[PDB]
Amino acid sequence: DRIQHALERCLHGCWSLQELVSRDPGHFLILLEQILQKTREVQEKGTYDLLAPLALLFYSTVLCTPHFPPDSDLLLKAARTYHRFLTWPVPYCSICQELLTFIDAELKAPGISYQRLVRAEQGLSTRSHRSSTVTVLLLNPVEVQAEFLDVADKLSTPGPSPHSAYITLLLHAFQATFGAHCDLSGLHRRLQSKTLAELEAIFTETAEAQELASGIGDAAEARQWLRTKLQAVGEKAGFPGVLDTAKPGKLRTIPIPVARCYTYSWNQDSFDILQEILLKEQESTLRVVVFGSDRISGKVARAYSNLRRLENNRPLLTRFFKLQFFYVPVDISHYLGMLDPWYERNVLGILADMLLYYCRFAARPVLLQVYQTELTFITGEKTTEIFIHSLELGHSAATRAIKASGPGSKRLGIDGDREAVPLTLQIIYSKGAISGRSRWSNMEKLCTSVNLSKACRQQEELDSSTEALTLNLTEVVKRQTPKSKKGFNQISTSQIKVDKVQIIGSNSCPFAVCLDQDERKILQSVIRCEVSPLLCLPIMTFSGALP
């Protein structure tokens, strides 16, 4: 009853408390009952919002639960309930099909999914063709946060040995089929004396049996064959009685071990250390966890753009591999939480558990909308490929700053809030790309300051999922020459919804760009600025961009 209340409190948002209430093996089955009831209500009432969090909670609980009872019908009821979801739209029926396959695999092989996840994360020996492993990198500058640095240190500890990982995997696999009829204490005592090679052989045999049983085709026959094979393996390896040996021996949770997380600071050098950790792994998939505020959003987008330019002839992706990116805020997180309520409640909101949960159970990538900026200089050289979230354009003190920077130094004074002398500004904006009809419009006047903002920064009070850009004319000319009425003098905040922008200066009036107060980039002396809108940065979230 209290588990149902905790579930209800979790949905209408609590989270770690809800996960920790499941301390007893029967709490797993109780929570599964509650989740199935909530899912049935959701389907009956057609509530699209609650499907993804409920699906994820069911997946996690079934992954962690030990030894579904032989008489239990949770798996069959869940299979029917989800198979009823095939008439739902694509982002929901996709999760439906994923859970249906997962449920079928867990019903045929009771501990297939937990064994798969733990074996992949710990990088244990695999006899399957093209063996896979999971590596976690926590990219933490030493100036991110003390609490987050400490939690990364806790995750960075090597912790369990391959011996202990094999013991835990074998214990979970044998309990998932022999729940209360196996002596887990005696089995662990016998396993503690086993050698590493023996443990590896036993684990490989059990894993092969589970994979074979996962595709038998008949649930009862698959379970019977897996039970027979596990009994044979136990008899071969000298295991004690595992068939109805002792009723007193009750269930044990066997929680997921801490994944082998590596904490290395890359110092914002465009993801250089990823190649180093590839090389170390040589001597599959890797999970990148990015910690930091908005100040490193530019660094992250440059790094990913460089990686997406380079991987075509780099060993990171040519070797069997999968690169996943996770972001923790410590405003990308605002946008992600706006799209994903689960991300808002769990990540954007004892902490190592949540980081591991986000790493393990976030499988839907959301492509962050980034803007491609190209600047044509006053000297004839053309620069391209600049990525931002907002932009401040036209400042003459900023072009003095860019001239001070030159071709090999930082643009000191590009931070904005600087007086600008009037310049000859041409504004070109493209409108109407919602219907595929791009309409270009032109103005040519005198201007000092222009704001180029993304609605996603303030999308909480606007049209849902609006990828458009806002061009704002405000605080213009009055900063230096308030009496210059010929140009854009004063001008209250005027907003134009735009998608592509071209702002053109003049040689006698040099132009400048402020890239969210990023002074690291070098741009010599620019005049023409072109901003254009699948793009970049697929940050993983629990549920993708629901339509």
Binding site: G46, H83, L86, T87, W88, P89, V90, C93, S94, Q97, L100, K431, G432, I434, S435, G436, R437, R439, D463, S464, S465, T466, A468, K497, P547
Partner: protein, 989 residues
Amino acid sequence: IEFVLPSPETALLHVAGHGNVEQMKAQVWLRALETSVAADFYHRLGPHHFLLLYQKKGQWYEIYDKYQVVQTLDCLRYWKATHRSPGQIHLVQRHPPSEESQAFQRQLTALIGYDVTDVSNVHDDELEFTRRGLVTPRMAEVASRDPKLYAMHPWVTSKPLPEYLWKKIANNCIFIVIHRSTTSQTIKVSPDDTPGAILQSFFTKMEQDFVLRVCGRDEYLVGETPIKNFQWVRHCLKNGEEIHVVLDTPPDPALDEVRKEEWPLVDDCTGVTGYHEQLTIHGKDHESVFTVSLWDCDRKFRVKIRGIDIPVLPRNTDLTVFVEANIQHGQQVLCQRRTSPKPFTEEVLWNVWLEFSIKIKDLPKGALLNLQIYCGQLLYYVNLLLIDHRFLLRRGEYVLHMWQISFNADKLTSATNPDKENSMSISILLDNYCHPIALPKHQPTPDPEGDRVRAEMPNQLRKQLEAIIATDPLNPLTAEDKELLWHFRYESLKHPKAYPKLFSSVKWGQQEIVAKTYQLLARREVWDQSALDVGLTMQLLDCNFSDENVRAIAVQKLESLEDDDVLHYLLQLVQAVKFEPYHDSALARFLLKRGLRNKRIGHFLFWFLRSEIAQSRHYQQRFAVILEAYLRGCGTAMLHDFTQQVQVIEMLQKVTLDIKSLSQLKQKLENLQNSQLPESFRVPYDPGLKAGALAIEKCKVMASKKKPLWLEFKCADPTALSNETIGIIFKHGDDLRQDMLILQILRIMESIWETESLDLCLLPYGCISTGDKIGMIEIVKDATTIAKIQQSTVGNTGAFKDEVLNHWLKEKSPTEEKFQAAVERFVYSCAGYCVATFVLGIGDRHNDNIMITETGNLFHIDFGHILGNYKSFLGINKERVPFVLTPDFLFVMGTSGKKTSPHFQKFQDICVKAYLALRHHTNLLIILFSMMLMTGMPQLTSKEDIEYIRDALTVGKNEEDAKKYFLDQIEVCRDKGWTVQFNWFLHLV
């Protein structure tokens, strides 16, 4: 399924079930590449795709659908019926169309005036699939066609000869004047003798391979039918003219050859959808689910309005805008949702999910999502067919270009505005699915019969139902009436007159009610042996019935019409094609088949359909596809005739356009006559007549604000008995679709009066619309205008005198007997036109649009001029008269004493007879009026306009009361003698 590769290589494939096996193209392609290095080499030179073909009946068929093998069930069914388990499918190359094929397509495009092959304004392949699917009825009609009878196209009727024509047969004998070379012989033959008997009698009255062709016309008196049953013979008897024929060699059937079909037969699109049990996901293993039944989806319907995009804002109204989405089925809004009002600018963003209260399983076939942009009133509209023509629910993003308004047929179109660069555009998102969602087959079988009722109705409820059935079509049904009709649906089948009301009582927004309706109409028999009622069929083909099965029922009853009966209602059927939700409907197939069967029906169908292609953008593509199918069907001789007609029409279009921009007309006419003028062309409003040279010295331009061309052509037939020319008015700047609809209604009314043995001397002229605001009108000879008759003596200053018309008619009568005949004809024609214009509501006209011949007959002309004014104003803000009964007409009839006269009494009697005759067909007249208002009006109609007729036709009243009503109308006409005409003159001046 064995496959035959393009090298005679036989690759034995295996039946791969039905789940996502339209990679069968890719599967067989990869298998061919593996099994032949020649295929590997040809991969670098082969086309993009190939074609899979089989042989259903020896003739070659194509599998034209790329989604699932469930579609291909017809080939498998034929193979299992023939018991040949290994089926052969030939893989053939996508050979490009030949040079002659492209030339023929270009000629067809020139004839149609629209490029059917252009796929730049389609978001699906419904039009192309209709093009492919219309081949089967076309080939069926071409194969089952009598060559000689088609070539000679006799115009016959099976209706009994009217008594006023029977009295014109003096001694049960008819004289026919047969011409051979310059010799002419009169042969007396009984009216019950076939043309073969007449020809044998002529030969015995001294080879035998000859026919009788009407002199001066391309009309033949052939076939096995009594000589009295020919429309030409009846026309000659009615006009008292002598029947002249010539002994002509029969036209060669080889001239009507049809070129071979390029495309293989496409079969049907009903394969993708099966019964519910086959499409449902319940009982499946979530791995064999390749399609999802529509009736499984229990969720509410949901559509995401993304935004609105316009290049430049209209300045009519602004400052607020919202979107209203209506799920509706045949003008019945099943559900309606609205968006929040937002400021009206060039681009408005909502990105809001509108979720209706209608379940997805409850969406019927032909359900229509009407997206309307309102302001603050309505600004734009567009429609999307929720269920595709393959019985598939729509999914994905749609950028639909909207229609701008300037109850209407054009509001039901599923076409998208072709003006991409300037029109309003609305972006919507419909949910995507892993598996396609298919609406199951309409009804598996009524084996349980839907619990057909056994208990007798109580007497009181029987009386209530019978009272409901007898009521007029326009009388609304309350909730109680609909509940009674549906609750006793199995009793309402026994009365065919209740079918429109019964099917209007069906709740189309519920799936089970639609299934019960299909079970109900699956056991229709009283309707099948029911005598054909044109009014009931028209009611079933109206805009209120969007269901495919009801339309199929109506067309099935239409199929029993005669050729002349189809000619009577051909324009109404073409207009009713607008109401069909899908392009390939039973009405389109019926029109195609009956235009291919008869040459006259085909000619008039071509012109009626080309006019709609030219003037109506909403239904350009559907009508263009239908016309392309017909033109591919008809023979090459009639294609050449159509080409010559289109050539002369286009060059006269150019001449009218050049003259209207401004002796000059004369010079342009000699430029035409010496170059680019065909030697002879078939007259568009009269296919039996061939106009030859142009009498340039007689052509002119009327003193009209439109400046039409008065042309007179020479008759191309040397066998013509008179030197009379052919008059044709080519007019620009007026919409002639309304005029020709009114003329068709007048012809139908005349047919009704003939059925009740009444000759009102009302004869409509020949008007055909040929293009956007341009058309052609027949010139009635020896006729002038009443306004011009008045202006001869008094009327230039507005003064009007009563004796003008009687004296004018007297002057044109050579003798006293001719004057008496002219007076009688004037009385009859005036009564007929007064009754017709009062019933149709176009009676409030002026003298400038009323004509009279020298024989006394009366005419109303330029119906488009007054129809629009009547629709806009209805005469409620001025002094309105029921019809033009001017005191000059009364003086021609009576003694002007305003008491009575024998001719006036006869006029009253005959007009009352005609009024009651029309009241006998009240239902047909009402449905025709409703269709005319829906289709012929570029504006938007509503109630209080359609129902006017049920006040004019005196619906629901005694015959004596209706007679008194028409007498009161006559009296109020006699009260306003010159007031309304003087007011019209002041308004014009």
